[PDB]
Write a structure and sequence with these properties.
Chains A, B, C, D, E, F: It is found in: Cell membrane. The structure is a homohexamer. Helices cover about 60% and strands about 0% of the residues of chain A. Chain A has helices spanning about 10-20, 25-40, 45-50, 55-80, 90-95, 100-105, 110-125, 150-160, 165-180, 185-190, 200-210, 215-225.
């Protein structure tokens, strides 16, 4: 991450972190990809950088391998077109005498550009999901002094950003809302957990139950418990 | 929210958040719309972005559907004018051969622009009110260590920004001032609630009652209660 | 408060807040008006914005009504001049065919400009004093953990900024120094209040009396009181 | 303090505050005057602003009255020169047909400029010392939780900035170090005050004596005192 | 670190600190070198600065000594080429009549530049590893009030940045996670240390064990211990 | 420190403070001098400012006196050269008809410039060491709530920046590490001081001994001591 300054830093910094804490195929990352891909039209060079600067080394290597395969697919299609489309593998990858540096890739037509975009995004989706890298839905833990309402919001935020199906997302938040809570709050949730009535939102009850923990009142109570 | 940088970010970021926490038809959002609509005269492209970047996906879809309908209405009127006004649906939506990109929409006359503004603002108002999305008047809760006066001010601020009729606004603040207070303060308000005499402002009394909570004095008292 | 950016923001933001917390005719606001009016010479358009962006809706409406009246007065005078002065109502309000947009108002002579300034400032002073809007001299309250010396300074600051006659200002600060203090400090002031000897400044004694509240010493004392 | 922006703000803001908290003739203010006067050569207009923007209304009026007198003195000298020096009162004050606006004053010769500088600085020194305005050497007080070493440093800083003769400065710091200390520290200094042996610096001993106040150790002690 | 401003500061500041806290051959430093070397193509002058500004005096001297040796090696190779390559020692070091200042070094060909890069990076790797300078994997210690989860993350971060072989890295983190913990947490880890079952991650258990330390609950417990 | 803005501020601000807290001949100041002198080549005017803006009034006066003497020395040498070197005292000091303002000094040759640099740096070193001005190695004291590890690091930092011979530096840090510690930590070090075994670093042991002070554990202990 050196070289003084590139034509764009923030977005690349953000995505790099995003991938590390949410995963290459996460809703969060997929959203940014969608955003940036449809907006800042990219050339094969750009994609080379965008992935290189945001995916972990091994993840990049899978991306690029898949990329190449995707290109090959489209080249078959382009030769099979009637009329044929004059776009070779070299143009789609940004590899060769005619499509090397930015100056040549800058002259790509929208047909080629689009086709590259499609390919890459497919390739991206083909990146193997991390089963171990900061699966943030279970790394977020309540800090010793953090208000439960902040915790939960944080948790949910992460869940929105990592878990794709809302149904599952909901379950996970509920489970983690208990499991990763600090002792101070688990003791409030434990007698509630599993007894929450239908209709009422679970994490909603959980906030209520913990309402007050961390304040003066709570401390006083615990001081009573220390003496008694 | 990628693509490095647009010609304007802050306002769009603000409104996006605003809609999420106060709602599309809220006084807050409606105020900003009014401000920006009458000021930074907009073209159909702009409106497409302004809504797309601030409304939730489903909300956008309702906006645009309504938008189109609104256009149709005005087109009927324009054809029914004497003399006829040369403004077709294509010009009002920014869809077609003559009114596609910004460069063509930039040449719209003030008659067309205005008409678009009117339409959109009507369309905006036709967006279905969220009955669930962060109804912030009941999401704001007093933090464990927050002074009651800050809480209330916050509450009121939100109420000004979400509840349109002052009469109702007042009631809601009063109710929420008790309900969402932390335990430390509810215990001070509970013996007061419902016994507040006419004339005297309710939340004014509530502040008085809680004056002192959170300081050293309060803690000392509670330490007495811990021992005793 | 949208439209991306105007040729000037901070001053207008400041004044808007100022009016809300101190009042249209307050020493604070009157000072800024004086400053800006004599300095950044203004055209009727500017005044239209300056008031529109800083006065509350109802307050603006009173301003402008009065503005017009003021203009009428000066127009009578201008016609009664010997030689007559060629300045009509249209020029003073910025309303009409010859004095509409900024481009025409930019060509106003200093005689007209001045006359507008005089009018507006008079008009401003004719805005009805709020008897309810954040009368900050009685909204400032001591926070639960705030040192009394900071409180007092704050109070005085506000008093300088809202109360015009120093004599009264002094009384009000003294009264509010007690009344809006937190319980921790009222208990120190109560036995002093009303018994302060002549000559010695009242709030000076009040600081002395409360010197120490909020520190470790104070807490220790109160812990004694909790146990005993 | 409005008018959007002048060609220079920071310095003027600083000096205004400086005068309010240290006084027009204070070492601090006199230092900045010396600095800026010898450096950024000024014209009578500038001086008019520099004083107007930094001295309190009444103080300004005394400045300018004295200014004028000073000019008169130099005009006598200039007429009495051999050869006579062509510098009239109008040139030194920046008042008149030939020396009005900046454009004319910009053409002043260094002889005139200097002479103005000399005059003003003398005039400045003739401003009556405030016997009441924030005599900061006795307004600085130790906060309830402030470390004593910090307090002292602050005190000294102020003393350097307000008291001119070091001999007196030293005495005042020593006296105020005790007098304005918080109760927690006075109790440590009181048994030392007045018994400090010669040679050893007084405030040095005072720091030693209070070393430790405000930490956990100190609190524990005081908790013992609460119970006992 | 004076001279007002160079054409680039941040990176050089970062690396200087990096070398001091992680070491010249650390994964962290080696990563930045790789990044910057392959990206911002450098001339011998640049390398002279890059090392001079980031390596400790003695470390620089070893670098440069090795640098020269490396050059000599390549010069042998260049003379042994068929055809011979016209690159002398003077060109590779940036020393001499033809390759002195930046203006002459700017004209180096990519063959020479590359060759310099290779040399330097080899030379860099030949810098003797510090066995004493801030071996940060054992300087990071848990602060008295720091949550254990933050500590550990910090520790790991440092380990990633200083220890090259992951296998060893893991061991070191585990050992230091106990050893450099504060007393509050060691008492929680001590009964666990060495009894952690296979499969379960060690520092994962360690976090669990310490979950809760530093909160109100923990303090209450300890207050019980104080009394009892 | 007025005059709005010079061509360079930061460095001069830094050095001024540096001299005040570490001393004119300190390693810290000497390092910056070396840096800036060899880098931003200076003219006699610059040196006049650099010293004037960083040395205390009396210190400046000694500098300049010595400066002049140094010049005289070099002038003797220049006249004694074979061939003679055309550099008079006027050129080296920046005093006279031919070498007055920056415009003339800008035309100095590198021979003259260098010679000035040498002179000044020698002159600088001839500035009398302060035996009283903030000898920061004995002004830094541990704050009431500061972790011992931060203290120590701070101390060492200062020692690196003020004490030149490492041998002595080490002793001083060790002594001050005890002496300027707060009571909370002295009580931990006192039983260790002087009994530290050879080989093991002294301040290393001192950190260990104090590890834990300031946390919850420590407070609990002290609460026991309060009751008992």
């Amino acid at each position: 991450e050196a070289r003084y300054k590139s034509f764009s830093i923030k977005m690349l910094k953000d995505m790099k972190e995003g991938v590390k804490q949410y995963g290459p195929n996460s809703p969060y990352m997929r959203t940014l990809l969608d955003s940036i891909a449809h907006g800042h039209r990219l050339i094969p060079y750009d994609w080379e950088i965008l992935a290189k600067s945001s995916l972990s080394p091994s993840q990049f290597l899978q991306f690029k391998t898949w990329w190449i395969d995707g290109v090959q697919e489209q080249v078959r299609r382009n030769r099979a077109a009637n009329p044929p489309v004059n776009i070779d593998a070299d143009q789609l990858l940004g590899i060769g005498q005619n499509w090397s540096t930015i100056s040549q890739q800058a002259l790509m037509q929208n047909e080629a550009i689009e086709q590259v975009r499609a390919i890459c995004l497919r390739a991206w989706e083909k990146i193997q999901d991390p089963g171990s890298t900061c699966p943030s839905f279970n790394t977020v833990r309540q800090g010793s002094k953090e208000p439960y309402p902040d915790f939960v919001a944080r948790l949910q935020d992460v869940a929105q950003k990592s878990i794709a199906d809302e149904k599952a997302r909901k379950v996970i938040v509920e489970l983690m809302a208990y499991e990763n809570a600090n002792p101070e709050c688990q003791s409030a949730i434990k007698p509630l957990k599993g007894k929450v009535p239908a209709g009422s939102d679970v994490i909603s009850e959980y906030v209520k139950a913990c309402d007050g923990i961390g304040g003066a009142m709570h401390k006083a109570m615990l001081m009573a418990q220390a003496i008694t």
